[PDB]
């Protein structure tokens, strides 16, 4: 009758489930649908800073293409 | 002859962990010299341009250095693509 | 909403630890022909709530022969380090992208000694003073093996960025390349969390409990929370480190499901091992790692550092 | 900020747990509870005496090995070097010295938990 | 020279005082001694990270590796006076007089 | 304002050191060292020294562990000392607090404190350097150069650790 | 002590000193210093007596503190110049800091109370090692940095070194203790001329070295630790005690013996550089050394001392341990004055 | 060094790290590579007690590159005057200084 | 000891190419291959003179040439570029690996049109 254990870990699974999408969704929520732009090196940080400056809204994940330029 | 083989057998029985560790370790030093691909690993490491290849001031008589980044002459890493 | 994400990290881990105290009592019992707790709610689902309420409203006895400062600080250290050591884990998008996440978490893993020692000495009992040194020696002597195993495994990953570890595995499970190593690593994990085969600190004949003797009610339950949070955290560490999974960036939920399933399987293996094996002896306990585990780990690390060079397959640094 | 915010959240959360733990319950506060414990008795006149021990040697060889573990930690970054041959020989030297220290520890009693 | 340099230098000065001005304990004194090298370790890492001294980045751990070795013997000496004498209290530590 | 954190990280370093050197009970000196190291790891970290900061974290929180390992073995007694036992320790502690406080008060007023060397009270954020790192951390690459340029360093160290385990063997051998 | 272990301790001590006098990077100098520290503690604990534990503990504390202050000087001149190369310092307090850090390792200033005690604790062979080999490294560092040392500092420090070296040995009967005090006096002697010209401190180091081996080998050829014990040896080894006396004459610097040459050279170059008051102080205070030197001579050879009845069966046994180099060791430490010009070889 | 075996028997043993204009890993220059290049190539084969005075301006320029004592003191003076007159209230920082 | 050489506020006034990191990384190889010459000479000036005050004109040249390149790619296939840069943007590392489809869809246009 091992299935009696099945509820026991099921909520446990749900307990470990929530940290999965919650971090995943909020990132997607915060960065304009895009996932978080990880800056593991100073070049990435410089790219993020230039994107933030170009956006004009102090939001790096806001991105504008050629329609923004002449 | 017989003594060496018997000692190896006893070690493989008495302390099997010791012989396994000593073996795999002894390989760990002698293969890299024997292996024919470590030079290719050196090529891998030299291939990656962590910094900018700052150009040279052109003055004539350097046929080796390409004039354009699309030029045919110059260093190539097609071996990297095949690898 | 950053703090909301933090809370969404802590609180679910707290429910996970809470219901681990039910799944262990059910799994063990079923492994030894016992139905387990199924009286408090449906299938014993409510049982962890009742024991938690009891331990919160149980009297916390102040050890008369003690300095209360460490008697209170040690649960703080043990619990807070255990939870903040979940911070840099590669969920499909890890909460904190620390460039040295694996080293970060390995360094914090050594801090449990800094709860064990104060608990064992401040409580001021023979069992406590014995078990403090014995458990300290256990965990410190296995931390080294954890370290070389981590280094040798990582030498094929590329860096200490723990988010790229998924990118390392992708095709094949990493255990397929380091099954001799993982077999040690997992066991050393079993040693560091003080589990029945390797616990040696409880020893309910000559140490009784070892460190959580005079701790009662709340501070006592805090060390259990730390202990059964390290179970989940290190099983998850092993799960990603060796039992890789798929992760499509457009569907983050897939890797989440695969990872939680791996963590549950590994925790069930923990309970599986403890429900069967006898308990080590301190003599054999340190004989297992000094005489046997450490030389094999050294040789395997040598093998796994020489291997990328000879195969011309050094992992990408960035 | 971010990371520091997580550390702050965790430490405050832990402190709330310990505060509720140590304050919420009620105790009659009677004297004879303070008597210490040992499997039914009290720990006589001990639990703070100097601990005549032997595994001190294991404890110190832990630290001596930990220094060398720190020394070999930079390996994943070190493997990304141009002169891989020297890195290979010298790292192999480091692990060989690890093994030699362990072996001298072994034969000369040493790591053998003293009696 | 900013305040961080003042703070770690001043921490070293009081570590010098604490270890060198013995109060009654040998173990706590060598503890102050190893805190001394912690102050020096941080101090050394500061300039080295500041000035982009890329090679010297390996000097701290090197500086570290030896220093713990000192403590590795220090406490090791501590047990050897302790088993015979009984404690680390350095006021009985008087047998060598003349 | 969390501007001054890079300052205060050092400040909590100082007064956690004084109590560590206030000659208290050995474990309380250990606690002082522990908080000092924990707050100094931030000092190195926010300067960019991620690897060195985590490195000292690991090795040092093992190193004070082992110095504990004999504190309950070869240093405890019937009545262990308390951080309030001796009367002089409070005086040492308060003399620890008021000196750097007066000096920082001056550095906040005159910015030209004359103690020993030459120092300015204008924070620490200035001394950082503008630039970049490409796709490599300078600290990690520098500590990785140990196996390519650290020709002599690793050799002499490993030899010293071997000699260290030998001497640790010999002095504690007990005939 | 395993013979091979003892050899590997020998050569790690010697290699720690070698690293000091061959390295150029400052960190390497520190590394050699602690290599030697870490290597010499076990040999001092070879006998394993509580006196040996005492001596080793005091040595460890003193030298560890000194090496930590060495790194302080190291870090400061790095901070103020960003150059690990060993040369003239660019920050004054860093120079001073290194000066006391090395001095504590040498036993010159009030940082000298360790050496007499540690010499008392250990066996006489460990004493030879301590008072001969563990000077070469700090002297070499002091020679390399002679460009910028505060002359006042070095001069006064050498002055106390010789002065308390002379005074401390007067009320000591243990041969190890009087030898430690004599070594402190010689420490002051060379360190006084250290700032002016390092060739002469090198020469005095050489002479003190050869005299010290010539001394210690005679002690443990007689196997004596107290003045009375040496006095009892006037019988069994008359030749050894006569050479005892002649090298004890070379001790103070009575011409034409070897010990006079370094004093003469140091005073002559000090006078070349207008320091005329300074040399007269050590010239007078060397009589303090000569005093307990003469006391040791009287107890050894000049006056017969009451032997013991049992002592006569010692007559039946011969010293088997050869303890080589002793003849030339005596000879170089007794008659080298007609070879004074050879000092130019060191320059 | 005392007995310089390094240039006698012909190898570098420690000279690789001594100064920070040497060949750094992957050509990562130091903060003051230019200044210390100027200083080192200024004082070469000249003698320390002679080179310390000819190569002086290079030396303090190097030291000020390392520590920025003078520059940070100048910044401190500027900030002092700015805050003083702002508290006593004459002008307002231009929008580039606010946003 | 000397004062300044800072060029006038009018001197360092160029049209700053205001595009996003994903767009720039999507262009990348084609942009470099078709605009190397101003870039190469600009940082040859930067490394030789060690002095940006001497290389402002090189900066104006590289900016204007890159802008011209962006104008030509705008004049032609931009919807493949739009999809490509959006897909690169979705990556948290701007990884080229999970974009190959649109990569082809881009590389063909500038091949058969430009
Ligand atoms: C001028 C330069 C040259 C100076 C020469 C004269 C002075 C040197 C010392 C005396 C030599 C004569 C002698 O008999 O020596 C052995 C003699 C006997 O050894 P012991 O340790 O006294 O007694 C134990 C026995 O060796 C019994 O054996 P054990 O198993 O107990 O010990 C093993 C034995 C060596 O065993 C071996 O198998 C070798 O150990 C030693 O000899 C001690 C030194 C370390 C190991 C030997 C390696 C030397 C290189 O030792 C001494 O006379 C003094 C002990 C230390 C010797 C080395 C000192 C080096 C530094 C001194 C200053 C050097 C000049 C600096 C300028
Ligand atoms: C604020 C302070 C308190 C903080 C703790 C949380 C709040 C209090 C606890 C709330 C739940 C328990 C309430 C008491 C229940 C009780 O006494 O019996 C329950 C009982 C258990 O019945 P039983 O089986 O014990 O009955 C007696 C049986 N014999 C006679 C054989 C001994 O069940 C119920 O009342 C039915 C509802 C239970 C819960 C329904 C959901 C379960 C699935 C989800 C579980 C996980 C999420 C929660
Ligand atoms: C200058 C001398 C300084 C010392 C003078 C005072 C001590 C005189 C001798 C006291 C002991 C008396 C005695 O019986 O000595 C016997 C001893 C060995 O006898 P023998 O071998 O004849 O010595 C000369 C070589 N054939 O012979 C001796 O002891 C005589 C002296 C031997 C050493 C030579 C003199 C010193 C050289 C330096």
From Swiss-Prot, chain D:
Keywords attached to this entry: Electron transport, Membrane, Mitochondrion, Mitochondrion inner membrane, NAD, Respiratory chain, Translocase, Transmembrane, Transmembrane helix, Transport, Ubiquinone
Keyword NAD: yes
Name of the protein in question: NADH-ubiquinone oxidoreductase chain 3
Subcellular location(s) per record: Mitochondrion inner membrane
Domain of life assignment: Eukaryota
GO biological process, one term: mitochondrial electron transport, NADH to ubiquinone
Any Pfam family matching the protein: Oxidored_q4
GO cellular component annotations of the record: mitochondrial inner membrane; respiratory chain complex I
Chief localisation class: mitochondrion
EC number: 7.1.1.2
InterPro entries the UniProt entry points to: NADH_UbQ/plastoQ_OxRdtase_su3, NDAH_ubi_oxred_su3_sf
The gene coding this protein: MT-ND3
Transmembrane segments: 3-23, 55-75, 86-106
MF (Gene Ontology): NADH dehydrogenase (ubiquinone) activity
Membrane topology value: Multi-pass membrane protein
Cited function: Core subunit of the mitochondrial membrane respiratory chain NADH dehydrogenase (Complex I) which catalyzes electron transfer from NADH through the respiratory chain, using ubiquinone as an electron acceptor. Essential for the catalytic activity of complex I.
Family indicated by similarity: Belongs to the complex I subunit 3 family.
Top class in the EC scheme: translocase
Reaction catalyzed: a ubiquinone + NADH + 5 H(+)(in) = a ubiquinol + NAD(+) + 4 H(+)(out)
Gene3D superfamilies registered for this protein in UniProt: NADH:ubiquinone/plastoquinone oxidoreductase, chain 3 (1.20.58.1610)
Subunit annotation: Core subunit of respiratory chain NADH dehydrogenase (Complex I) which is composed of 45 different subunits. Interacts with TMEM186. Interacts with TMEM242.
From Swiss-Prot, chain E:
The gene coding this protein: MT-ND4L
PANTHER family: NADH-UBIQUINONE OXIDOREDUCTASE CHAIN 4L, NADH-UBIQUINONE OXIDOREDUCTASE SUBUNIT ND4L
Keyword tRNA-binding listed: no
Family indicated by similarity: Belongs to the complex I subunit 4L family.
EC code: 7.1.1.2
Cellular component per GO, a single term: mitochondrial inner membrane
Protein name: NADH-ubiquinone oxidoreductase chain 4L
Assembly: Core subunit of respiratory chain NADH dehydrogenase (Complex I) which is composed of 45 different subunits.
Function per UniProt: Core subunit of the mitochondrial membrane respiratory chain NADH dehydrogenase (Complex I) which catalyzes electron transfer from NADH through the respiratory chain, using ubiquinone as an electron acceptor. Part of the enzyme membrane arm which is embedded in the lipid bilayer and involved in proton translocation.
Compartment annotation: Mitochondrion inner membrane
Keyword vocabulary terms for this entry: Electron transport, Membrane, Mitochondrion, Mitochondrion inner membrane, NAD, Respiratory chain, Translocase, Transmembrane, Transmembrane helix, Transport, Ubiquinone
GO annotation (BP), single: ATP synthesis coupled electron transport
Main localization (coarse): mitochondrion
Reaction(s) catalysed by this chain's protein: a ubiquinone + NADH + 5 H(+)(in) = a ubiquinol + NAD(+) + 4 H(+)(out)
Source organism: Sus scrofa
Matches recorded under InterPro entries: NADH_UbQ_OxRdtase_chain4L/K, NUOK/Mnh_C1-like
Chain segments annotated as transmembrane: 1-21, 29-49, 61-81
Catalytic EC class: translocase
Topology within the bilayer: Multi-pass membrane protein
GO MF, one annotated term: NADH dehydrogenase (ubiquinone) activity
Keyword field contains Metal-binding: no
Covalent S-S links between cysteines: none
Swiss-Prot record, chain F:
Reactions listed under catalytic activity: a ubiquinone + NADH + 5 H(+)(in) = a ubiquinol + NAD(+) + 4 H(+)(out)
Entry's Gene Ontology BP terms: mitochondrial electron transport, NADH to ubiquinone; mitochondrial respiratory chain complex I assembly
Transmembrane segments: 1-21, 25-45, 47-67, 88-108, 149-169
Keywords: Electron transport, Membrane, Mitochondrion, Mitochondrion inner membrane, NAD, Respiratory chain, Translocase, Transmembrane, Transmembrane helix, Transport, Ubiquinone
Gene3D superfamilies: NADH-ubiquinone/plastoquinone oxidoreductase chain 6, subunit NuoJ
GO molecular function: NADH dehydrogenase (ubiquinone) activity
EC number: 7.1.1.2
Job description of the protein: Core subunit of the mitochondrial membrane respiratory chain NADH dehydrogenase (Complex I) which catalyzes electron transfer from NADH through the respiratory chain, using ubiquinone as an electron acceptor. Essential for the catalytic activity and assembly of complex I.
UniProt-recorded name of the protein: NADH-ubiquinone oxidoreductase chain 6
Gene (name only): MT-ND6
Curated annotation (Swiss-Prot), chain G:
Key words of the record: Electron transport, Membrane, Mitochondrion, Mitochondrion inner membrane, NAD, Respiratory chain, Translocase, Transmembrane, Transmembrane helix, Transport, Ubiquinone
Transmembrane domains' residue ranges: 3-23, 25-45, 59-79, 89-109, 149-169, 178-198, 200-220, 237-257, 274-294, 325-345
EC number, as in UniProt: 7.1.1.2
Subcellular location: Mitochondrion inner membrane
InterPro entries registered for this protein in UniProt: Complex_I_Subunit_2 (IPR050175), NADH_DH_su2_C (IPR010933), NADH_UbQ_OxRdtase_chain2 (IPR003917), ND/Mrp_TM (IPR001750)
Catalytic activity: a ubiquinone + NADH + 5 H(+)(in) = a ubiquinol + NAD(+) + 4 H(+)(out)
Membrane topology: Multi-pass membrane protein
Keyword flag Transmembrane: yes
GO MF entries: NADH dehydrogenase (ubiquinone) activity
A family per Pfam: NADH_dehy_S2_C
One GO BP annotation of this record: reactive oxygen species metabolic process
GO cellular component assignments: mitochondrial inner membrane; respiratory chain complex I
Subunit: Core subunit of respiratory chain NADH dehydrogenase (Complex I) which is composed of 45 different subunits. Interacts with TMEM242.
Function in brief: Core subunit of the mitochondrial membrane respiratory chain NADH dehydrogenase (Complex I) which catalyzes electron transfer from NADH through the respiratory chain, using ubiquinone as an electron acceptor. Essential for the catalytic activity and assembly of complex I.
Family of the protein in this entry: Belongs to the complex I subunit 2 family.
Protein name: NADH-ubiquinone oxidoreductase chain 2
Organism: Sus scrofa (Pig)
Classification of source organism: Eukaryota, Metazoa, Chordata, Craniata, Vertebrata
Name of encoding gene: MT-ND2
């Amino acid at each position: 009758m091992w299935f009696e254990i099945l509820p026991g870990i099921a909520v446990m699974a749900a307990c470990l489930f929530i940290p999965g999408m919650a971090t995943a969704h909020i990132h997607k929520f915060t960065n304009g649908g895009k996932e978080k732009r990880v800056a593991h090196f100073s070049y990435q940080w410089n790219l993020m800073e230039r994107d933030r400056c170009i956006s004009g809204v102090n939001r790096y994940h806001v991105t504008k293409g050629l329609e923004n330029i002449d | 002859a017989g003594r060496i083989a018997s000692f190896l057998k006893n070690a493989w029985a008495k302390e099997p962990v010791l012989v396994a560790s000593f073996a795999i370790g002894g390989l760990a030093i002698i293969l890299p010299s024997l292996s024919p691909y470590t030079n290719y690993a050196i090529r891998i490491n030299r291939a990656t341009p962590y910094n900018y290849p700052v150009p040279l001031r052109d003055d004539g008589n350097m046929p080796d250095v390409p004039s354009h980044p699309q030029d045919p002459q110059g260093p190539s890493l097609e071996w990297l693509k095949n690898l | 909403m950053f703090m909301i994400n933090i809370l969404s990290l802590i609180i679910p881990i707290l429910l996970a630890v809470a219901f681990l105290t039910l799944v262990e009592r059910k799994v063990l019992g079923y492994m030894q022909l016992r139905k387990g707790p199924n009286v408090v709610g449906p299938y014993g689902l409510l049982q962890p709530i009742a024991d938690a309420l009891k331990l919160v409203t149980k009297e916390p006895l102040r050890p008369g022969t003690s300095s209360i400062s460490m008697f209170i600080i040690a649960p703080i250290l043990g619990l807070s380090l255990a939870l903040t050591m979940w911070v840099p884990l590669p969920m499909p998008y890890p909460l904190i992208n620390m460039n040295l996440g694996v080293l970060f978490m390995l360094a914090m893993s050594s801090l449990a000694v800094y709860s064990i020692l104060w608990s064992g000495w401040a409580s001021n009992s023979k069992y406590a003073l014995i078990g403090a040194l014995r458990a300290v020696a256990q965990t410190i002597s296995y931390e080294v093996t954890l370290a070389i195993i981590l280094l040798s495994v990582l030498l094929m990953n590329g860096s200490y960025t723990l988010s790229t570890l998924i990118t390392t595995q992708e095709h094949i499970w990493m255990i397929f390349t380091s099954w001799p190593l993982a077999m040690m690593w997992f066991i050393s994990t079993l040693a560091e969390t003080n589990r029945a085969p390797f616990d040696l600190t409880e020893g309910e004949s000559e140490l009784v409990s070892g460190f959580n003797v005079e701790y009662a009610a709340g501070p006592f339950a805090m060390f259990f929370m730390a202990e059964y949070a390290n179970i989940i955290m290190m099983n998850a560490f092993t799960a990603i480190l060796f039992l890789g999974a798929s992760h499509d960036p457009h569907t983050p939920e897939l890797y989440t499901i695969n990872f939680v399933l791996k963590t549950l399987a590994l925790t069930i293996t923990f309970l599986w091992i403890r429900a069967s094996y006898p308990r080590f002896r301190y003599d054999q306990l340190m004989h297992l790692l000094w005489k046997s585990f450490l030389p094999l780990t050294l040789a395997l690390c040598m093998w796994h550092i020489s291997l990328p060079i000879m195969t011309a397959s050094i992992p990408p640094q960035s | 900020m971010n990371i520091m915010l997580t550390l702050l959240t965790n430490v405050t959360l832990a402190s709330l747990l310990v505060l509720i733990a140590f304050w919420l319950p009620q105790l009659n506060a009677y004297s004879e509870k303070t008597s210490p414990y040992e499997c039914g008795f009290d720990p006589m006149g001990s639990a703070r005496l100097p601990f005549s021990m032997k595994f001190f040697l294991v404890a110190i060889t832990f630290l001596l090995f930990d220094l060398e573990i720190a020394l070999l930690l930079p390996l994943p970054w070190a493997s990304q070097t141009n002169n891989l041959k020297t890195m290979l020989t010298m790292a192999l030297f480091l692990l060989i010295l690890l093994a030699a220290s362990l072996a001298y520890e072994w034969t000369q009693k040493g790591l053998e938990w003293a009696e | 020279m900013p305040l961080v340099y003042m703070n770690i230098i001043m921490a070293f000065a009081i570590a010098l005082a604490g270890l060198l001005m013995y109060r009654s304990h040998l173990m706590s004194s060598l503890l102050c001694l190893e805190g001394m090298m912690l102050s020096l370790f941080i101090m050394s890492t500061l300039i080295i990270l500041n000035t982009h001294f890329t090679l010297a980045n390996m000097m701290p751990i090197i500086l570290l590796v030896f220093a713990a070795c000192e403590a590795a013997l220090g406490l090791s000496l501590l047990v050897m006076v302790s088993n015979t004498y009984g404690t680390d209290y350095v006021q009985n530590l008087n047998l060598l007089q003349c | 304002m969390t501007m001054y954190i890079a300052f205060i990280l050092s400040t909590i370093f100082v007064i956690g050191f004084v109590g560590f050197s206030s000659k208290p009970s050995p474990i309380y000196g250990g606690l002082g060292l522990i908080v000092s190291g924990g707050v100094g790891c931030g000092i190195v970290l926010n300067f960019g020294g991620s690897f060195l900061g985590l490195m000292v974290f690991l090795i040092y929180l093992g190193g004070m562990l082992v110095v504990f390992g004999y504190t309950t073995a070869m240093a405890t007694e019937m009545y262990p000392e308390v951080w309030v036992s001796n009367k002089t320790v409070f005086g040492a502690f308060v003399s620890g607090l008021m000196m750097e406080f007066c000096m920082v008060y001056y550095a906040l007023k005159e910015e030209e404190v004359e103690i020993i060397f030459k120092f300015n009270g204008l924070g620490d954020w200035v001394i950082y350097d503008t630039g970049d790192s490409g796709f490599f951390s300078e600290e990690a690459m520098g500590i990785a150069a140990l196996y390519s340029y650290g020709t002599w360093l690793v050799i002499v160290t490993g030899w010293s650790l071997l000699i260290g385990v030998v001497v640790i063997m010999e002095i504690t051998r007990g005939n | 002590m395993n013979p091979i272990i003892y050899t590997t301790l020998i050569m790690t001590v010697m290699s720690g000193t070698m690293l000091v006098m061959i390295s150029s990077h400052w960190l390497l100098i520190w590394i050699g210093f602690e290599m030697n520290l870490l290597a010499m503690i076990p040999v001092l604990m070879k006998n394993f007596n509580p006196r040996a534990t005492e001596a080793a503990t005091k040595y460890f504390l003193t030298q560890a503190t000194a090496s930590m202050m060495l790194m302080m000087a190291i870090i400061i001149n790095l901070l103020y110049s960003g150059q690990w190369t060993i040369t003239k310092m660019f920050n004054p307090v860093a120079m001073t800091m290194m000066t006391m850090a090395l001095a504590m390792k040498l036993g010159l200033s009030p940082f000298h109370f360790w050496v007499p005690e540690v010499t008392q604790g250990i066996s006489l062979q460990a004493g030879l090692l301590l008072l001969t080999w563990q000077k070469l490294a700090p002297l070499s560092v002091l020679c390399q940095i002679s460009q910028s040392i505060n002359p006042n500092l070095m001069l006064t420090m050498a002055m106390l070194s010789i002065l308390i070296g002379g005074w401390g040995g007067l009320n000591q009967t243990q041969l190890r203790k009087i030898m430690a005090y004599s070594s402190i006096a010689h420490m002051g002697w060379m360190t006084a001329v250290l700032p002016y010209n390092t060739t002469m401190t090198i020469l005095n180091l050489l002479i003190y070295i050869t005299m010290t081996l010539a001394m210690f080998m005679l002690l443990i050829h007689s196997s004596a630790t107290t003045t009375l014990s040496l006095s009892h040896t006037w019988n069994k080894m008359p030749v050894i005690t006569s050479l005892m006396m002649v090298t004890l004459l070379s001790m103070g610097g009575l011409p034409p013996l070897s010990g006079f040459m370094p004093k003469w050279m140091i005073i002559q170059e000090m006078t070349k550089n207008e320091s005329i008051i300074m040399p007269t102080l050590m010239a007078m205070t060397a009589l303090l050394n000569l005093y307990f030197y003469m006391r040791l001579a009287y107890s050894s050879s000049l006056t017969m001392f009451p032997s013991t009845n049992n002592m006569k069966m010692k007559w039946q046994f011969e010293h088997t341990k050869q303890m080589k180099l002793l003849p030339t060791m005596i000879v170089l430490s007794t008659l080298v004055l007609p070879m004074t010009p050879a000092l130019s070889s060191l320059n | 060094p005392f007995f310089d075996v390094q240039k006698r028997l012909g190898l570098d043993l420690d000279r690789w790290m001594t100064i920070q204009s040497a060949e750094q890993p992957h050509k990562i220059p130091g903060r003051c590579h230019a200044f210390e290049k100027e200083w080192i190539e200024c004082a070469h084969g000249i003698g320390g007690i002679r080179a310390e005075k000819e190569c002086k301006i290079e030396f303090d320029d190097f030291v000020e590159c390392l520590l920025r004592q003078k520059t940070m003191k100048r910044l401190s003076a500027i900030k002092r005057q700015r805050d003083k007159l702002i508290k006593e209230g004459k002008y307002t920082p231009p929008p580039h200084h606010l946003g | 000891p000397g004062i300044v050489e800072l060029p006038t506020l009018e001197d360092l006034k160029v049209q700053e190419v205001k595009v996003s990191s994903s767009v720039l990384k999507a262009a990348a190889h084609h942009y470099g291959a078709q605009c190397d010459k101003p870039n190469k000479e600009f940082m040859l000036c930067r490394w030789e003179e060690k002095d940006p005050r001497r290389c402002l004109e090189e900066g104006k040249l590289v900016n204007q040439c890159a802008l011209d390149f962006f104008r030509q790619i705008k004049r032609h296939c931009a919807e493949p570029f739009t999809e490509y840069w959006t897909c690169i943007d979705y990556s948290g590392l701007q990884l080229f690996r999970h974009c190959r489809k649109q990569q082809a869809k881009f590389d063909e246009c500038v091949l058969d049109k430009l």
